[PDB]
């Protein structure tokens, strides 16, 4: 993680649930997108 | 007292707050809401939906333009800014008695005085105008 400073400030594989920019726009009980079918939703609780 | 108030810290409502002795805590907020609701907009299922399949929002209600002003007394400007105007087909809310908002019980009874689906509708609505008007959070989100 400390390597990615001059690079992206957050990892391509990072924690979404620490971003104040990706906070409002985020949907989380999404659980999966599947072609020709749709999307899979998992309301589980608060995480903020 | 927007956002910061006398009781600034914490969620605004507590168990004792609901279990308080006011016994009709829902009254004044319900009053305030039935005031602001008519102009704040309604969901379809709480709109007085058109029986008339002619005052669709897309057309208008009635022909306010009795006739087009073809014989302009000013031929120098044959253009007309009043070609054909109508009466307006805004969607209406229900009658107040047909407005479950106007069911007195919630003052004391609380949210459990309705049909379930209607309860759902009102909650979605309360979220709606809270996000649109709870100015504290409303600015906070845009800040964030």
């Amino acid at each position: 993680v400390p390597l990615f400073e001059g690079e992206l400030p957050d990892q391509p594989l990072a924690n979404p649930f620490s971003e104040r920019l990706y906070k409002l726009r985020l949907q989380e009980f999404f659980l999966g997108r599947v072609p020709h079918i749709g999307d899979f939703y998992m309301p589980r609780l608060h995480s903020y | 007292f927007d956002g910061k108030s006398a009781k600034k810290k914490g969620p605004l409502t507590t168990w004792e707050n609901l279990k308080s002795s006011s016994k009709k805590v829902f009254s004044n907020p319900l009053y305030r809401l039935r005031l602001v609701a008519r102009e704040w907009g309604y969901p379809r299922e709480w709109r007085q939906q058109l029986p008339s399949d002619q005052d669709i929002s897309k057309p208008k209600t009635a022909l306010f333009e009795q006739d087009e002003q073809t014989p302009v007394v000013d031929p120098s400007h044959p253009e007309i800014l009043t070609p054909n105007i109508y009466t307006w087909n805004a969607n209406e809310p229900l009658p107040l008695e047909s407005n479950p908002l106007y069911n007195r019980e919630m003052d004391k009874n609380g949210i459990l005085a309705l049909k379930p689906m209607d309860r759902v509708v009102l909650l979605r609505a309360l979220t709606d105008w809270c996000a649109s008007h709870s100015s504290a959070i409303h600015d906070e989100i845009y800040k964030l």
């Binding site: 906070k23 409002l24 949907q27 989380e28 009980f29 939703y41 309301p43 609780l45 608060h46 995480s47 903020y48 | 969620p11 605004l12 409502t13 507590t14 168990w15 379930p116 689906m117 309860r119 759902v120 909650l123 979605r124 979220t127 996000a131 959070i137």
Partner: protein, 48 residues
């Protein structure tokens, strides 16, 4: 099961999640089932 009323609940919950500071802790662990039973909703009907 056809549940005409779920995604509404979903918005309820996600909103509540993003606004944790605004909400009671008892609100913070709420679930879908809480609302189902409490609000008296049963699945199955395409009509509610």
């Amino acid at each position: 099961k056809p549940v005409p009323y779920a995604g509404d609940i979903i918005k309820l919950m996600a909103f509540i999640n993003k606004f944790s500071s605004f909400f009671h802790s008892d609100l913070q662990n709420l679930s879908f089932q809480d609302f189902e039973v409490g609000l008296d909703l049963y699945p199955g009907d395409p009509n509610g």
